[PDB]
């Protein structure tokens, strides 16, 4: 087609990088197999990262990149365009036979909603790719399904469950849990206790593009391209359930 107002829009590129890294991760899984989960996870992280950095340098040579699997030289702090990527989110689950709760996260941050374009691939689920440019956008829910980490679920859940009826759904991957909200498999994804920008940036972009809610647990906006890319808590959910959950979280501090 004509150039937007090989060359892709940033959203198309986000989507194409996510799929391509997804295919490579699927190849790595088939090749290395599961006998040594540490070895499998390492190669997954490293090979996906290599592919992503190669393609970003070739196809967006002027953009900065923040990746979990690369040293951070902080030049991004001066740029107006920064790719925030997780080459493999849910390394643990990827490394486990039969599991499909792992993801590739490709977010574009642009200086000003700072995550303007994003994609989340779930390679083991037919390599589906959720993208900000094609995702589309209720009531009083007496009981809530909330996706939480299968490894390190947040302690604050215990407190809010004293007053809200909640069933926690234990799932790996920030990306997988966020897309479960998009799918309607759960009502919300709640995390506390630690995380990094690459874990949530692409899922946040997609969530917001879908007209859904994405914020810090205290309700304040998720902020990206920070000096310290540590970003330890989030709420992602249907718009309707955000005041209920944000309120319950707030009341947990009373």
Ligand X SMILES: Nc1ncnc2c1ncn2[C@@H]1O[C@H](COP(=O)(O)O)[C@@H](OP(=O)(O)O)[C@H]1O
Residue 89 within binding range of ligand X, rule CB under 6 A: yes
CB of 9 to ligand X, least distance (A): 26
Residue 215 within binding range of ligand X, rule CB under 6 A: no
Residue 219 backbone zone (phi > 0: left; psi -120 to 50: alpha; other: beta): left
CB of 198 to Mg ion, least distance (A): 7
Q: Quick one: the chain helix, strand, coil %, rounded to 5?
A: 35, 25, 40
Place of tokens 């196809």: 59
Q: Residue 146 half-sphere exposure, CB side, CA atoms within 13 Å? A: 26
Residue 174 within binding range of ligand X, rule CB under 6 A: yes
* Rounded-to-integer distance, Cα 143 and Cα 15, Å: 34
89 assigned to a ligand binding site: yes
CB atoms within 10 A of CB 17: 26
Residue 101 within binding range of Mg ion, rule CB under 5 A: no
Among residues 193 and 211, whose Cβ is nearest to ligand X?
Answer: 193
Contacting ligand X (CB under 6 A), which of 49, 67, 195, 215? 195
Discontinuities after residues in the chain (C–N over 2.5 A): 5, 112, 137
Three-state secondary structure string covering 49-94: HHHHHHHHHHHCCCCEEEECCCCCCCHHHHCCEEEEEEEEECHHHH
Among residues 16 and 89, whose Cβ is nearest to Mg ion?
Answer: 89
The span of 36-44, 50-58, 62-70, 210-218 binding Mg ion (CB under 5 A) equals 62-70
CB atoms within 10 A of CB 134: 13
Order of strands across the sheet that contains 234-237: 166-171, 144-149, 188-191, 234-237, 213-215
Residue 233 within binding range of ligand X, rule CB under 6 A: no
91 assigned to a ligand binding site: yes
Residue 20 touches which of Mg ion, ligand X, none (Cβ within 5-8 Å per kind): none
Residue 67 within binding range of ligand X, rule CB under 6 A: no
The span of 80-88, 119-127, 203-211, 234-242 binding Mg ion (CB under 5 A) equals 80-88
* Rounded-to-integer distance, Cα 207 and Cα 214, Å: 7
Residue 93 within binding range of Mg ion, rule CB under 5 A: no
Size of the site for ligand X (CB under 6 A): 15
* Rounded-to-integer distance, Cα 236 and Cα 82, Å: 22
The span of 114-122, 132-140, 190-198, 217-225 binding ligand X (CB under 6 A) equals 190-198
Size of the site for Mg ion (CB under 5 A): 4
Which residues sit at the interface with ligand X, rule CB under 6 A?
A: 68, 86, 89-91, 149, 151-152, 172-174, 193-195, 199
Residue numbering of the annotated binding site for substrate? 68, 88-91, 199
Residue numbering of the annotated binding site? 68, 86, 88-91, 199
């Amino acid at each position: 087609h004509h150039h937007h107002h090989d060359d892709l829009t940033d959203a198309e590129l986000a989507a194409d990088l996510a799929a391509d890294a997804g295919k490579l991760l699927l190849q790595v899984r088939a090749e290395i197999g599961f006998d040594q989960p540490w070895t499998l996870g390492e190669a997954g992280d490293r090979q996906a990262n290599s592919l992503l950095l190669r393609r970003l340098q070739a196809e967006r040579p002027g953009d900065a990149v923040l990746s979990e699997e690369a040293h951070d030289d902080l030049a991004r702090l001066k740029s107006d365009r920064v790719w925030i990527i997780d080459p493999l989110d849910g390394t643990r689950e990827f490394s486990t036979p039969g599991r499909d709760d792992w993801a590739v996260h490709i977010a574009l941050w642009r200086r000003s909603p700072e995550i303007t374009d994003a994609a989340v691939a779930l390679p083991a689920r037919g390599n589906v790719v959720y993208r900000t440019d094609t995702v589309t956008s209720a009531g009083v829910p007496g009981t809530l399904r909330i996706a939480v980490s299968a490894t390190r679920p947040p302690a604050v859940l215990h407190r809010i469950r004293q007053t809200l009826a909640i069933q926690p759904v234990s799932i790996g991957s920030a990306g997988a849990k966020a897309m479960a909200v998009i799918d309607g498999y759960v009502d919300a994804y709640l995390h506390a206790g630690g995380q990094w920008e690459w874990d949530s940036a692409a899922p946040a972009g997609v969530m917001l593009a879908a007209g859904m809610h994405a914020s810090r647990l205290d309700g304040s906006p998720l902020r990206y391209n920070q000096l310290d890319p540590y970003l330890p808590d989030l709420l992602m959910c249907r718009a309707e359930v955000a005041p209920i959950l944000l309120g319950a979280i707030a009341d947990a501090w009373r």
